[PDB]
Amino acid sequence: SWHRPDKCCLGYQKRPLPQVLLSSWYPTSQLCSKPGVIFLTKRGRQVCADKSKDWVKKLMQQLPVTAR
Amino acid sequence: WHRPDKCCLGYQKRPLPQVLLSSWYPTSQLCSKPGVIFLTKRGRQVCADKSKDWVKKLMQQLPVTAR
């Protein structure tokens, strides 16, 4: 019964992330506990970030959104 | 690094027949809504409200998913 669980960010990446290590990103549902975006590194790791921080907003602009 | 965690934003309304389920798993207490995730025999993941009795019953009948 496709009602699948969603990816939410319970914690945030503190240190800014170097763009050369990221591939894309995608927002998490608004229904999640806290607002957040998930960054996909080129290695395939998912990383949670606070969309309120200026450094993450820069990353959201420079990087494309994940196809999925 | 902070990986995202699985949270239930929606619930399974109609009770699920235990015969279609393999196990279940709890979600973080830090998620907006309390919930549990059931893994169907076919390997799918269904979200459910651990508040409902039919859900509590399955939690006891079924083993915890070995994740």
Swiss-Prot record, chain B:
It comes from the Viruses. GO terms for cellular component: extracellular space; protein-containing complex. Keywords: Cytokine, Disulfide bond, Secreted, Signal. It is found in: Secreted. Disulfide bonds join C7-C31, C8-C47. Blocks infection by several different human immunodeficiency virus type 1 (HIV-1) strains. This occurs because vMIP-II binds to a wide range of chemokine receptors. May form part of the response to host defenses contributing to virus-induced neoplasia and may have relevance to KSHV and HIV-I interactions. Belongs to the intercrine beta (chemokine CC) family. This is Viral macrophage inflammatory protein 2. It comes from Human herpesvirus 8 type P (isolate GK18) (HHV-8).
